[PDB]
Homo-oligomer: A and B are copies of this chain.
Amino acid sequence: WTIGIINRVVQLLIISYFVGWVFLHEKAYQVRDTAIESSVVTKVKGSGLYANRVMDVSDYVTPPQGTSVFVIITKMIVTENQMQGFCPESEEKYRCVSDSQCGPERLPGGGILTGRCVNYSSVLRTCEIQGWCPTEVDTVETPIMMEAENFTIFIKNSIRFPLFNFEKGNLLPNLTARDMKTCRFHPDKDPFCPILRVGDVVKFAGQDFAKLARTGGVLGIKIGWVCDLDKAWDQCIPKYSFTRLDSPGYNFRFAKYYKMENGSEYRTLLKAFGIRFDVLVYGNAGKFNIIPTIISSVAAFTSVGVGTVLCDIILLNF
């Protein structure tokens, strides 16, 4: 009967269309390269005021070289003119009543205990220690550099998909609305401008610059390179997203080492709180390939061939 082939032909049309659209949607004919090879060069620009000091890129940015992870220092604690010696620790956790509770068995690790219980002040009695004196008092409150919100981060990112040897950069003057020197990334108005406003990045990550600068934190500027290398070079485009990674705070210690004319050594101990920026470059490209196209083909051919049998059994049996 002719209807049998009109039923089978309709079966093949519909089923093959479902299968066809499904496989065509997931790019099942594409080999995928998920090992992007990225290079990131960052440059921060701006100046702020902290205490009665002016902070420039050499004062608050660390490291200086412009790596994928850098820190803009917003608040810091200074302990000036430390020198090796003996002094009573100011931390209450080191409180003692006699030299019998200042032995090595107490607080394993941490500073060096001399073994004497000494009077840091009139209100506290702590174990004496050998080290940089006086000791640090990290419980005080200090200001924060507010101008850091208005600093700009310029991110140059140069990636390459090695499986296809397709390399490209994120400096795209045609895609930017304004000049490169004066543009400013906006997810909607200028999403390809490589210049980011620090405060903007803080907003895109859903963070308050006040609290963040106060406690420090870790934000991620995410550069995504989802690309179809079957399409034009113009189609491989970076997409920027932002996130807070510590989800607290972020601080680190470093000293400025000075020496006296008589040769003795003394440092300025600095506890730095700031916003660390981690440029995280993800990317995956898909290029047409014979092998995935053949495997997907056999899959769709056989799958339709079974679906028509099952549909005949489900339809005819009913």
Interface residues of A (CB under 8 A from B): 22-23, 26, 28, 33-37, 39, 41, 43, 45-47, 49, 52-54, 56-59, 62-67, 69, 71, 84, 108-112, 130-132, 150-152, 156, 158, 162-163, 167, 169, 218, 220, 222, 224, 243, 245-247, 250, 252-259, 261, 267-269, 276, 278, 280, 282, 284, 290-291, 294-299, 301-303, 306
Contacts and interface: CB of A to CB of B under 8 A. Distances in A.
A185 B109 CA distance: 16
Contacts of A53: 84
A34 B64 CA distance: 32
A73 to B, nearest CB: 10
A109 B255 CA distance: 28
A65 B58 contact: no
B158 A247 contact: yes
A41 to B, nearest CB: 6
A184 to B, nearest CB: 11
Contacts of A28: 291
Given A158-B245, A224-B162, A109 B39 contact: no
A62 B62 contact: no
11 contacts: A26-B290, A37-B222, A39-B245, A56-B111, A56-B131, A56-B253, A58-B269, A63-B63, A64-B253, A67-B69, A294-B303
Contact of A45 (B43, B110, B130, B278): B110
A84 B162 contact: no
B291 A302 contact: no
Nearest to A220: B39
Contact of A54 (B41, B84, B108, B294): B84
Nearest to A109: B46
A261 B259 contact: no
A302 B301 contact: yes
A290 B22 contact: yes
Task: Give the 7 A-B residue pairs with the shortest CB-CB distance, closest first.
Answer: A54-B131, A64-B254, A58-B255, A34-B35, A298-B302, A39-B245, A298-B299
